[PDB]
Design a protein around this ligand. Sequence first.
Ligand SMILES: Nc1nc(=O)c2nc(CNc3ccc(C(=O)N[C@@H](CCC(=O)O)C(=O)O)cc3)cnc2[nH]1
Ligand SMILES: Nc1ncnc2c1ncn2[C@@H]1O[C@H](COP(=O)(O)OP(=O)(O)O)[C@@H](O)[C@H]1OP(=O)(O)O
Length: 159
Amino acid sequence: MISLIAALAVDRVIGMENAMPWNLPADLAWFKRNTLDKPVIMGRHTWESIGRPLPGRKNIILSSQPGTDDRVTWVKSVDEAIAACGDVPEIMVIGGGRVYEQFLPKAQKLYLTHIDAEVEGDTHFPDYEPDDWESVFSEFHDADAQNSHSYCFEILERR
Ligand SMILES: Nc1nc(=O)c2nc(CNc3ccc(C(=O)N[C@@H](CCC(=O)O)C(=O)O)cc3)cnc2[nH]1
Ligand SMILES: Nc1ncnc2c1ncn2[C@@H]1O[C@H](COP(=O)(O)OP(=O)(O)O)[C@@H](O)[C@H]1OP(=O)(O)O
């Protein structure tokens, strides 16, 4: 099964030109916990912003162009990406906007982090109808000395 994982502010904003104005180490501990030892699919843009291959994960990058990094796998379409994952119990899709949009319709589960922040952004997570998903897990956290804003982790299963 395919799952999507993303952090979103109000308005489904997931990214902007510059770094986001927040610091959420807890969210990043969650992301890692949920993606480790699984293959992750991402768009060329997300990859550049990450910078290096995520450790302990099979990295598959989607690009219309030839790959410029032999440490990861480059594919040219959605179908190839899926096949590059092989026979695994769960494929994690990490972004960005374009990529989430293409995989949404094919995903069975969403691992979302709702951040209580209002920011200007230019990339949104795709609109989803809640009634189509069952919240199987949900846990709110207040901001703290380490996390600049409050947030809530939620796991959704496609009904
Ligand atoms: N929940 C969630 N949070 C995010 O920040 C997010 N980011 C992406 C794409 N951008 C990124 C950027 C950096 C790292 C990153 O450095 N990850 C290290 C974290 C080390 C730590 O725990 O700080 C990792 O190994 O996963 C991951 C994804 C995709 N889904 C998301 N989903
Ligand atoms: N179906 C697809 N086939 C090939 N490349 C694709 C793709 N969907 C997305 N991409 C790539 O993934 C990049 C988009 O990355 P992203 O989804 O991380 O970015 P954004 O968050 O800005 O929408 C696309 O620009 C394209 O890479 P190239 O610009 O190198 O062509």
